[PDB]
Ligand binder design. Sequence first.
Ligand SMILES: Nc1nc2c(ncn2[C@@H]2O[C@H](COP(=O)(O)OP(=O)(O)O)[C@@H](O)[C@H]2O)c(=O)[nH]1
Ligand SMILES: O=c1cc(O)c2ccccc2o1
Ligand SMILES: O=c1cc(O)c2ccccc2o1
Lengths: 301, 297
Amino acid sequence: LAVIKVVGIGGGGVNAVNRMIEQGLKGVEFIAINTDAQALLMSDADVKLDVGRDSTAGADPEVGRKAAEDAKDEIEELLRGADMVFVTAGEGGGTGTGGAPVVASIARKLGALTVGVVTRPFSFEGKRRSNQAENGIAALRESCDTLIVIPNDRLLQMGDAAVSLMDAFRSADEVLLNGVQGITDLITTPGLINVDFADVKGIMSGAGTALMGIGSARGEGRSLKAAEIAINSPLLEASMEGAQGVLMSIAGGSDLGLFEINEAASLVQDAAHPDANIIFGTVIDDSLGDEVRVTVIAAGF
Amino acid sequence: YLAVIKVVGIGGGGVNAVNRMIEQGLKGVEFIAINTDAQALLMSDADVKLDVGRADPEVGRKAAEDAKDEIEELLRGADMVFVTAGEGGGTGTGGAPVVASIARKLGALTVGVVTRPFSFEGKRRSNQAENGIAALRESCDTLIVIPNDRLLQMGAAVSLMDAFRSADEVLLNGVQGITDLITTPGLINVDFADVKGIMSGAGTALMGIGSARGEGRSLKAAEIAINSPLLEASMEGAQGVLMSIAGGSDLGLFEINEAASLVQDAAHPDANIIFGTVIDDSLGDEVRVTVIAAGFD
Ligand SMILES: Nc1nc2c(ncn2[C@@H]2O[C@H](COP(=O)(O)OP(=O)(O)O)[C@@H](O)[C@H]2O)c(=O)[nH]1
Ligand SMILES: O=c1cc(O)c2ccccc2o1
Ligand SMILES: O=c1cc(O)c2ccccc2o1
């Protein structure tokens, strides 16, 4: 069994990990890293590391980088043993922006399959945060096998138009969960089409920057509808058909049959780049009832 | 009247080890987490927590010494204290000998547990892995040394992630194999005074582990444990041996006694041998044998 560790670093990443835990993401070890002990006391993560205590990131990515570097041997000892490490953060602050590349580089040095899952900040958060996020993403990309970047701006095209600010950030938490769980559930709770760790590692190793799409549907033709929503997701930036590497997971209950799964795969193949490498896997989750959830990770544009 | 056993994890590696013990449900001991870094704190659900941080051995040593009164108060009343800085290194390497010294001056049977890193990890100057081991040895009654390199000889071809996971698991057993023998009823129970007799002032100890299922599982697991690469072919010369067999409540006396007879044959003729068993019905039909060997011929 592959050992998967999910790191949330900075306030946004720790909030995302708390949401993952609250929604019952299974089969992974949760690690919260932050510069604020009180926030960490309230987190339900398995492992909690308070860093940068001497300095305390004032949203300063350089302080976040130095706090993580100062703690690097400690982080390494926590990550040792993982086959796969997710590094999750909201980019644009100090602790996550500056610290996430340190965590990922430790995981990549150890040879764990290292997947970043991060948000770009909303435009309304201001240009300094956008610039910081841009620099942090560039740094993180060099240290991850795959770095999934979720543009928060595109979340506002989805969901409800009467959303509040707090609502918007909870949707960000949820999409970071979706990005992690859409991959890890393939490994931890496979359905009819088993895509195991070595397959995931084959397509995500050295893949570079990636985008994600998500779709959910119920009822008649649910699998086709969920796949069409996913591949047209605003989070994929109208770029699905340019991607040459695609990992797709289809989750449902035991009532989800191979015919439905296959028609979803056919729809996605028809839409994909002519030379795309596409891996399809399924997830058994009886808590979904009659919902089907499709997650697409797209890389190699 | 019952043995009071306190398990101290110091520094990031040691606190993480204690957290793993707690997560795995190690019973019958008090867990103590001591943080030695000013810059970072690994949180813990240990019973007792002390942050002395006010990544180097001298820093951790002075941090612990500065807090010696507080550490002593935490350890007072223990009959047995385990101290470990766990995997890796940092300030915990410097703090651990200070904790051990305080425990021993209180009169507790003081058992250190230290890992030698894998050779592929490289080495940080001053010879500080070996210097950390030497410092802890001078402050402990017994120092259990786990040579991680020997894990690459145990079982298929070990992967890097496997190697690290195995290291974590055997470190946990450096504590649990002994503490369960003392704290947890089995068919064959031991006297703490005999444990203290064999481990007081013993110095370096090595550990062996084995497991087996099916018929003859007790003998098979014991043979594996006494031949374990982690014992460095030292079993035949050992003058103090502790052996614990963990297994289901249905394990028979004859089968258990076969394992006890094997370790007696394998140890030095003049060895002290403490033998017992632990009921762990969650192992199913598997048995797990731990051997601790100290002294030379
Ligand atoms: N998913 C999520 N993102 C957040 C939350 N709060 C803020 N963010 C985003 O994360 C970015 C970094 O903020 P934060 O993680 O608090 O800063 P840090 O602790 O200094 O890394 C912000 O610019 C927001 O886009 C949250 O509760 N959840
Ligand atoms: O969760 C905590 C809180 C602390 O005060 C602490 C102190 C020392 C060591 C570990 C610790 O973990
Ligand atoms: O975690 C483990 C797994 C085993 O292989 C084992 C075997 C013998 C003794 C203790 C043991 O602890």
